[PDB]
């Protein structure tokens, strides 16, 4: 038995009382960009119900070309019009640099990744930087609200940041 | 006011009962690659608890360079050793091709995006394809288990797909 097995076990209970199917587009027309950090249950964090929001999470909550891609699809095909960015404190990107990280994998693997680790030092500065990354971007344009916050992994609180 | 606003309210009542902080590395040493789809509450779907699992999401659960980047970080930095891949039935990715989408964007903006929109026509198949990408990828290696499932939006049951 692995943890994949346990989660599949857990799925049997969830499926017992699943009610659906709900309609495809987000019923509150909002999309969240979050981090993949294990301490962040993005749904309970904002009281999201099923069928309501799009949630997008990667390492560091970095607005990547996959995040733009996702977002662009989200607005243009499933009619989202709000955006919430969510970095957080004690995030796992203020501990390594890109040069360090790639050299690491280079030693083992023999090659460098083409992609960019996208680490950053200060989380708050990067909520700013990530907001900007969406401002300038020409494909995520259909939104009437774009605000980015910082999740306090010690307290559960959202602290907005000004661009 | 807005949904962002409503969500923040909900965050207040979350931070009341919140117990933390927790340690960084996912306590059950697993990662999940999921879709951004509104109808998928991945945590409740696999019985996840705060601090256990990395959750990675995007449009259509595609193993883009972002997902590899996040997986390589998740494993190399925070020691995750199982991967769950998680497509689903009736995904937005099914109802368009890439060329059309980039075109629509151009006629609207004047620009073709640089990224591949990454649609697919068969969910069950592209699980194998997504599994196949991680398999042959030289930066996602430390994992012991790799399995892929299809979440059924109408029942809530997973359906394991095999390579
Ligand atoms: Cl999530
Ligand atoms: Mg913009
Ligand atoms: Zn993080
Ligand atoms: Zn989807």
UniProtKB/Swiss-Prot annotation, chains A, B:
<protein>
    <recommendedName>
        <fullName>Beta-carbonic anhydrase 1</fullName>
        <ecNumber>4.2.1.1</ecNumber>
    </recommendedName>
</protein>
<dbReference type="GO" id="GO:0004089">
    <property type="term" value="F:carbonate dehydratase activity"/>
</dbReference>
<feature type="binding site">
    <location>
        <position position="88"/>
    </location>
    <ligand>
        <name>Zn(2+)</name>
    </ligand>
</feature>
<feature type="binding site">
    <location>
        <position position="91"/>
    </location>
    <ligand>
        <name>Zn(2+)</name>
    </ligand>
</feature>
<keyword id="KW-0862">Zinc</keyword>
<comment type="function">
    <text>Catalyzes the reversible hydration of carbon dioxide to form bicarbonate.</text>
</comment>
<keyword id="KW-0479">Metal-binding</keyword>
<dbReference type="InterPro" id="IPR001765">
    <property type="entry name" value="Carbonic_anhydrase"/>
</dbReference>
<dbReference type="InterPro" id="IPR036874">
    <property type="entry name" value="Carbonic_anhydrase_sf"/>
</dbReference>
<comment type="subunit">
    <text>Homotetramer.</text>
</comment>
<dbReference type="GO" id="GO:0008270">
    <property type="term" value="F:zinc ion binding"/>
</dbReference>
<keyword id="KW-0456">Lyase</keyword>
<comment type="similarity">
    <text>Belongs to the beta-class carbonic anhydrase family.</text>
</comment>
<feature type="binding site">
    <location>
        <position position="35"/>
    </location>
    <ligand>
        <name>Zn(2+)</name>
    </ligand>
</feature>
<dbReference type="Pfam" id="PF00484">
    <property type="entry name" value="Pro_CA"/>
</dbReference>
<feature type="binding site">
    <location>
        <position position="37"/>
    </location>
    <ligand>
        <name>Zn(2+)</name>
    </ligand>
</feature>
């Amino acid at each position: 038995g692995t943890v994949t097995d346990d989660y599949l076990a857990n799925n049997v209970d969830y499926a017992s009382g699943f009610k659906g199917p709900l309609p495809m587009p987000p019923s509150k027309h909002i999309a969240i960009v979050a981090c993949m950090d294990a301490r962040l249950d993005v749904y309970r964090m904002l009281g999201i119900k099923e069928g309501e929001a799009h949630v997008i999470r990667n390492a560091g909550c970095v607005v990547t070309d996959d995040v733009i891609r996702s977002l662009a699809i989200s607005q243009r095909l499933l009619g989202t019009r709000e955006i919430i960015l969510l970095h957080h404190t004690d995030c796992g990107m203020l501990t390594f640099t890109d040069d360090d990280f790639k050299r690491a994998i280079q030693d083992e693997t023999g090659i460098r990744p083409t992609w960019s680790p996208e680490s950053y030092p200060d989380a708050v500065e990067d909520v700013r930087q990530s907001l900007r990354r969406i401002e300038v971007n020409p494909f995520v344009t259909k939104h009437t609200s774009l605000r980015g916050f910082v999740f306090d992994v010690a307290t559960g609180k959202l602290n907005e940041v000004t661009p």
